[PDB]
Design an enzyme around this catalytic site. Structure first.
Site, mmCIF file in Angstrom:
data_model
loop_
_atom_site.group_PDB
_atom_site.id
_atom_site.type_symbol
_atom_site.label_atom_id
_atom_site.label_comp_id
_atom_site.label_asym_id
_atom_site.label_seq_id
_atom_site.Cartn_x
_atom_site.Cartn_y
_atom_site.Cartn_z
ATOM 1 N N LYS A 132 0.850 -1.176 0.000
ATOM 2 C CA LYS A 132 0.000 0.000 0.000
ATOM 3 C C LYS A 132 0.889 1.230 0.000
ATOM 4 O O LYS A 132 2.090 1.139 0.232
ATOM 5 C CB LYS A 132 -0.929 -0.004 1.209
ATOM 6 N N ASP A 237 3.018 3.105 -17.602
ATOM 7 C CA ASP A 237 1.926 3.545 -16.731
ATOM 8 C C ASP A 237 1.543 5.006 -16.977
ATOM 9 O O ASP A 237 0.953 5.642 -16.096
ATOM 10 C CB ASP A 237 2.331 3.356 -15.263
ATOM 11 N N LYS A 239 -0.387 7.991 -17.456
ATOM 12 C CA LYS A 239 -1.781 8.405 -17.506
ATOM 13 C C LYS A 239 -1.897 9.670 -16.678
ATOM 14 O O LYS A 239 -1.004 10.005 -15.897
ATOM 15 C CB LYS A 239 -2.747 7.332 -16.986
ATOM 16 N N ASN A 242 -1.242 9.741 -12.916
ATOM 17 C CA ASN A 242 0.114 9.519 -12.426
ATOM 18 C C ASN A 242 0.994 10.738 -12.644
ATOM 19 O O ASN A 242 2.223 10.640 -12.568
ATOM 20 C CB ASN A 242 0.711 8.276 -13.083
HETATM 21 N N1 LIG Z 1 11.349 6.684 -9.784
HETATM 22 C C1 LIG Z 1 10.435 6.755 -10.745
HETATM 23 N N2 LIG Z 1 9.543 7.752 -10.626
HETATM 24 C C2 LIG Z 1 8.577 7.877 -11.546
HETATM 25 C C3 LIG Z 1 8.423 7.027 -12.615
HETATM 26 C C4 LIG Z 1 9.306 5.980 -12.741
HETATM 27 C C5 LIG Z 1 10.311 5.800 -11.786
HETATM 28 C C6 LIG Z 1 11.200 4.641 -11.957
HETATM 29 N N3 LIG Z 1 12.457 4.606 -11.575
HETATM 30 C C7 LIG Z 1 12.896 3.331 -11.870
HETATM 31 C C8 LIG Z 1 14.125 2.705 -11.723
HETATM 32 C C9 LIG Z 1 14.229 1.383 -12.094
HETATM 33 C C10 LIG Z 1 13.123 0.696 -12.629
HETATM 34 C C11 LIG Z 1 13.177 -0.741 -13.009
HETATM 35 C C12 LIG Z 1 12.221 -1.281 -13.861
HETATM 36 C C13 LIG Z 1 12.269 -2.622 -14.215
HETATM 37 C C14 LIG Z 1 13.282 -3.428 -13.744
HETATM 38 C C15 LIG Z 1 14.249 -2.901 -12.921
HETATM 39 C C16 LIG Z 1 14.209 -1.562 -12.569
HETATM 40 N N4 LIG Z 1 11.913 1.284 -12.738
HETATM 41 C C17 LIG Z 1 11.830 2.567 -12.361
HETATM 42 N N5 LIG Z 1 10.755 3.422 -12.480
HETATM 43 C C18 LIG Z 1 9.423 2.946 -12.749
HETATM 44 C C19 LIG Z 1 9.105 2.182 -13.857
HETATM 45 C C20 LIG Z 1 7.801 1.729 -14.019
HETATM 46 C C21 LIG Z 1 6.808 2.028 -13.090
HETATM 47 C C22 LIG Z 1 5.379 1.556 -13.251
HETATM 48 N N6 LIG Z 1 5.255 0.197 -13.767
HETATM 49 C C23 LIG Z 1 3.942 -0.473 -13.779
HETATM 50 C C24 LIG Z 1 4.193 -1.830 -14.436
HETATM 51 C C25 LIG Z 1 3.032 -2.777 -14.593
HETATM 52 C C26 LIG Z 1 3.206 -4.159 -14.562
HETATM 53 C C27 LIG Z 1 2.138 -5.016 -14.712
HETATM 54 C C28 LIG Z 1 0.839 -4.509 -14.903
HETATM 55 C C29 LIG Z 1 -0.291 -5.425 -15.055
HETATM 56 O O1 LIG Z 1 -1.447 -5.081 -15.161
HETATM 57 C C30 LIG Z 1 0.673 -3.115 -14.945
HETATM 58 O O2 LIG Z 1 -0.537 -2.527 -15.131
HETATM 59 C C31 LIG Z 1 1.763 -2.264 -14.797
HETATM 60 C C32 LIG Z 1 7.150 2.796 -11.988
HETATM 61 C C33 LIG Z 1 8.442 3.256 -11.821
#
Ligand SMILES: Nc1ncccc1-c1nc2ccc(-c3ccccc3)nc2n1-c1ccc(CNCCc2ccc(C=O)c(O)c2)cc1
Length: 388
Positions: A132, A237, A239, A242
């Site tokens: 959460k 994501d 939208k 967000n």
């Molecule tokens: N710090 C931040 N502030 C804002 C945005 C992004 C970051 C950020 N910083 C990041 C640093 C690293 C890695 C990172 C990513 C992958 C592997 C390793 C590392 N991601 C990092 N993101 C990040 C990337 C993606 C998301 C949102 N994803 C939703 C995914 C999903 C899955 C399944 C379903 C099913 O329904 C669905 O709906 C949605 C959030 C943050």
């Protein structure tokens, strides 16, 4: 030398459309586990598809011989669900995936105060399968943060997981991590929380943004997406809900997800295709369409009909939209990701070069030198005007 470690057909449950579809999967030595409509040496696979540090589990629901790959990606738990015909094939797949995750962990190692009673807990921001997010106030200082709380039993089954405070995003328009700590039972990620209001709130009241306003926000989002894609990460994501504004009017993309909204699904994501960086440019197109036209480009109460429009319907515009805006949006919302603006080898460069953004100096963007077109009605970072 990146080699295939195992390949073959799998039943993959859709990530949004919860349905089973056969897909041909390749598990590679770089840790990528990617599934294709047919059996297809390549460019950088996205870390979203990596099995690094994942936890594998067996289950017999809704079908026997099901298995699940569960990963902590940054601060979010991701689950991918698969099905095979026999329990022997499930074992061989799980052992191969675990082998690759073990190799990657070994390679990574070779190459390279705060507690829960320190906060007031003010408001639940969201709740999901795995944890959460709560709006908190740090007691020692009065500042506001969003705390993501996840149960340990979910991806540990762990002081090393506190090393996210080092791989922390520096980018001005992403959500930075302030603290990361653990209790006996849980992991707590304290992240920044912008107090300038939700962009959904601002757009709802103003009805429609001017093109200059949408250009400012879109350009800040493009800079953030470039940064993520340069780290081989897709956001997936994008939208309106967000997107928030900080006290000065700059964008903040939130990191509050927990294990959707169908109106934002890219075509290739509806068909459970191999998707990539192009899904983020599709999402930018939808939110910039919302900002400049005041409504979604595709909408219908009937999701079967919504999918048809997303897949099939050509995008229509108000004639008051400038031609530069119509061109940006038609480019971002091309159905085929290979023809989409930003879907090519230069990625964000194609978008940054579009004529709609001609006036933008991209170094001014990332350096926060662009004057925000709207200043939220808060005077400090602890002004709670927008918290309800
Ligand atoms: N710090 C931040 N502030 C804002 C945005 C992004 C970051 C950020 N910083 C990041 C640093 C690293 C890695 C990172 C990513 C992958 C592997 C390793 C590392 N991601 C990092 N993101 C990040 C990337 C993606 C998301 C949102 N994803 C939703 C995914 C999903 C899955 C399944 C379903 C099913 O329904 C669905 O709906 C949605 C959030 C943050």
């Amino acid at each position: 030398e990146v080699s295939v470690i195992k390949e073959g057909w799998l039943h993959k449950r859709g990530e949004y459309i919860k349905t089973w579809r056969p897909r041909y999967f390749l598990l590679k030595s770089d840790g990528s586990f990617i599934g294709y409509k047919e059996r297809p040496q390549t460019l950088p696979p996205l870390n979203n598809f990596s099995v690094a540090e994942c936890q594998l589990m067996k289950t017999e629901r809704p079908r026997p011989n099901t298995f699940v790959i569960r990963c902590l990606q940054w601060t979010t738990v991701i689950e991918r669900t698969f099905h095979v015909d026999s329990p022997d094939e499930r074992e061989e797949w799980m052992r191969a995936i675990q082998m690759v995750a073990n190799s990657l962990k070994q390679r990574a190692a070779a190459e390279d105060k705060v507690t829960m009673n320190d906060f007031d807990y003010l408001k639940l921001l969201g709740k999901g399968t795995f944890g959460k997010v709560i709006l908190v106030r740090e007691k020692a200082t009065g500042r506001y943060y969003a705390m993501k709380i996840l149960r340990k039993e979910v991806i540990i089954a762990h002081t090393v997981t506190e090393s996210r405070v080092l791989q922390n995003t520096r980018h001005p328009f992403l959500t930075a991590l302030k603290y990361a700590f653990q209790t006996h039972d849980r992991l707590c990620f304290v992240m920044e929380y912008a107090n300038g209001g939700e962009l959904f709130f601002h757009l709802s009241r103003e009805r429609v943004f001017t093109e200059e306003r949408a250009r400012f926000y879109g350009a800040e989002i493009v800079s953030a997406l470039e940064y993520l894609h340069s780290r081989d990460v897709v956001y997936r994501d994008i939208k309106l809900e967000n997107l928030m504004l900080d006290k000065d009017g700059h964008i903040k993309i939130t990191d509050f997800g927990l294990c959707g909204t169908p109106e934002y699904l890219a075509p290739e994501v509806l068909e459970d295709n191999d998707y990539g960086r192009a899904v983020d440019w599709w999402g930018l197109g939808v939110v910039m369409y919302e900002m400049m036209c005041g409504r979604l480009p595709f909408y219908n109460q009937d999701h079967e009909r919504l999918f048809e429009l997303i897949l099939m319907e050509e995008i229509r515009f108000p004639r008051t939209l400038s031609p530069e805006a119509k061109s940006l949006l038609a480019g971002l919302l091309k159905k085929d990701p290979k023809q989409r603006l930003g879907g090519g080898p230069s990625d964000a460069k194609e978008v940054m070069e579009h004529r709609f953004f001609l006036s933008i100096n991209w170094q001014d963007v990332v350096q926060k030198k662009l004057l925000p077109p709207f200043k939220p009605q808060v005077t400090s970072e602890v002004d709670t005007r927008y918290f309800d």
